[PDB]
Scaffold this active site. Structure first.
Site, PDB file in Angstrom:
ATOM      1  N   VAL C  19     -40.111 -27.675  47.334  1.00 37.20           N
ATOM      2  CA  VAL C  19     -40.913 -28.948  47.806  1.00 37.20           C
ATOM      3  C   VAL C  19     -40.064 -30.026  48.263  1.00 37.20           C
ATOM      4  CG1 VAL C  19     -42.583 -30.429  46.700  1.00 37.20           C
ATOM      5  CG2 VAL C  19     -42.540 -28.121  45.904  1.00 37.20           C
ATOM      6  N   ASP C 128     -51.756 -23.042  33.691  1.00 33.14           N
ATOM      7  CA  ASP C 128     -50.377 -23.674  33.452  1.00 33.14           C
ATOM      8  C   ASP C 128     -50.214 -25.238  33.051  1.00 33.14           C
ATOM      9  OD1 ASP C 128     -47.528 -22.933  32.872  1.00 33.14           O
ATOM     10  OD2 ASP C 128     -46.948 -23.136  34.933  1.00 33.14           O
ATOM     11  N   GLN C 132     -44.947 -31.102  33.429  1.00 30.49           N
ATOM     12  CA  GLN C 132     -44.222 -30.822  34.689  1.00 30.49           C
ATOM     13  C   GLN C 132     -45.185 -30.818  35.706  1.00 30.49           C
ATOM     14  OE1 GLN C 132     -43.419 -29.473  31.350  1.00 30.49           O
ATOM     15  NE2 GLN C 132     -41.220 -29.804  31.910  1.00 30.49           N
TER      16      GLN C 132
END
Lengths: 258, 9, 297
Positions: C19, C128, C132
């Site tokens: 990213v 998930d 983070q």
């Protein structure tokens, strides 16, 4: 988990309209037909069996094909490639364990290379603009099944069967939304096994009545009557198995009394 | 066999 | 293609690519590019990327990271995301001395819950949720990100991927092998996150499945048929599980008031059917005085 059951159903109702293929598309295909589509879908059903894929995966793939074929003219020599990639993409979306690309190459009897399949995958993702989360007949039935009082495994398996038969014939089933086909198939299955009918509770949920369902229901009834004579038979064979309570062996009702 | 090439003739 | 994007810096790393922070030379917009590597002779476009893209085009919501665009070259696949300053972990760490002001914890919870309830309303499981994966901007927003692990679900649900949810945030029904799990697993993770914003440390930091389980049991009590009908039948249930007593919640997260405590308990109910939905949680008295303050930094 009825806290989102309503919201979800509403959402699927909206999305099924936007994900609908174009009803007349086969008219505008110069080299392929409904009957060639019927052969493709029938083979995809076998493929689904061969690799023990979900039914949902089969419904998605068909949806992908019909949408893809609504805008892309395709040569008959290439129709099986469109289908293969469609099924691969559906497997990747829906399956815990999708078959790997080689497997898909293999079930075509090395008709297309791995490179072709992967290229067609990419092309399909493009033409569909990655919009893969499409509502199916299967997704509607599954919700409609919660309205059984009480649960009956023959009805469920029979409704699945019928909904699945509708995949084979673009004429007439492309005219109908997934939610309506699911309605028809549900009613038809319930009536065949128990004599019961489209329940009041689903009228409230769906807003559909036997009246609104009649056209699809007339069609599906014919299809069910004529199923043993249909040129494509993989679905009948599939639903002979115990996993589906042998429902393809049940006798269709000669009349619906509507 | 399900491993067929489809012949659309 | 990328022609109008000026890369600025690597932001973090994922699974099948990277990213970057980048900027649209023409609009000025600052974005994140998630570069996905393809080639061929592989298996093509990765199922994770297929699900992320398709699911994210359907979920346009102020507390869900926005997918702006997909640039789909013969060679590369680039996901274009709106850019957010930072992640909830890269923030709890920076407040490891302050602590996070309660109005901020509350705003964040409330925003998270709104994003989640949207996901669930659109038959998407996230699978998930962890700090983070939750991104914050400078104006006080927080947003669910990384839909890599997401999936479209049905009603009722089938069996989906067992191997699911980063361990520390994993629900006991998954830990115990239930063939069926649902929206409830996302709430569990949010619960764990709620605790974590409060204390600045993970609630249940196991390093194995059994370790995770036992840490949850010592905190919430070992589940019986009373609190969770069916448990004892669950595939990885063992009758040799030590039977620990349930703690008073005021000890689980001492700084929490009554209402927070109440909400946390609902979010960490054993029986997934009784665990509170994201939608219902939005109406919790905990949120009566909620606002949306800028991160105090």
């Amino acid at each position: 988990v009825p806290d989102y059951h309503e919201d979800i159903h509403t959402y699927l109702r909206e999305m099924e309209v936007k994900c609908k293929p174009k009803v007349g598309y086969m008219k505008k295909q110069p080299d392929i037909t409904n009957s060639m589509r019927a052969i493709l879908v029938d083979w995809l059903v076998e493929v689904g069996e061969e690799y023990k894929l979900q039914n949902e995966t089969l419904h998605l793939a068909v949806n992908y094909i019909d949408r893809f074929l609504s805008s892309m003219s395709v040569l008959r020599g290439k129709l099986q490639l469109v289908g293969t990639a469609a099924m691969l993409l559906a497997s990747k979306f829906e399956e815990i364990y999708p078959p790997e690309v080689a497997e898909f190459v293999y079930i075509t009897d090395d008709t297309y290379t791995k490179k072709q399949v992967l290229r067609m995958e990419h092309l399909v993702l493009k033409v569909l603009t990655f919009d893969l989360a499409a509502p199916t007949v299967n997704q509607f039935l599954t919700q409609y099944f919660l309205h059984q009082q009480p649960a009956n495994c023959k009805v469920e398996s029979l409704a699945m069967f019928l909904g699945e038969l509708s995949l084979i014939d673009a004429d007439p089933y492309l005219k109908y939304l997934p939610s309506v086909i699911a309605g028809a198939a549900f009613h038809l299955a319930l009536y065949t096994v128990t004599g019961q009918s489209w329940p009041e509770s689903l009228i409230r949920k769906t807003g559909y009545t036997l009246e609104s369902l009649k056209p699809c229901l007339m069609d599906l009834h014919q299809t069910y009557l004529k199923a043993p004579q249909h040129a494509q038979q993989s679905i009948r064979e599939k639903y002979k198995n115990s996993k589906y309570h042998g429902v393809s062996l049940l006798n269709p009702p000669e009349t619906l009394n509507l | 066999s399900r491993h067929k090439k489809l012949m659309f003739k | 293609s990328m022609e109008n994007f000026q890369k600025v810096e690597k932001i973090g790393e994922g699974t099948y690519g990277v990213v970057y922070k980048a900027r649209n030379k023409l609009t000025g917009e600052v974005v994140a590019l998630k570069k996905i590597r393809l080639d061929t002779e592989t298996e093509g476009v990765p199922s994770t990327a297929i699900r992320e893209i398709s699911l994210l085009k359907e979920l346009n919501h102020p507390n869900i990271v926005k997918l702006l665009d997909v640039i789909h070259t013969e060679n590369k696949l680039y996901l274009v995301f709106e850019f957010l300053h930072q992640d909830l972990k890269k923030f709890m760490d920076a407040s490891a001395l302050t602590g996070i002001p309660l109005p901020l914890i509350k705003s964040y919870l409330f925003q998270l819950l709104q994003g989640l309830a949207f996901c669930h309303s659109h038959r998407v499981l996230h699978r998930d949720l962890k700090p983070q994966n939750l991104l914050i901007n400078t104006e006080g927003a927080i947003k669910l990100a990384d839909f890599g692990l997401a999936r479209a679900f049905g009603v009722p649900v089938r069996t989906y991927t067992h191997e699911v949810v980063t361990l520390w945030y994993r629900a006991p029904e998954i830990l115990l092998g239930c063939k069926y799990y649902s929206t409830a697993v996302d709430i569990w993770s949010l619960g764990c996150i709620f605790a974590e914003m409060v204390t600045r440390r993970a609630l249940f930091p196991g390093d194995s499945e059994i370790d995770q389980l036992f840490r949850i049991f010592r905190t919430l009590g070992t589940p019986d048929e009373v609190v969770w009908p069916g448990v004892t039948s669950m595939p990885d249930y063992k009758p040799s599980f030590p039977k620990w007593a349930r703690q008073d919640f005021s000890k689980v997260v001492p700084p929490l008031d009554e209402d927070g405590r109440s909400l946390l308990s609902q979010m960490l109910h054993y029986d997934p059917n009784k665990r509170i939905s994201a939608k219902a949680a939005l109406a919790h008295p905990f949120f009566q005085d909620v606002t949306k303050p800028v991160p105090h930094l």
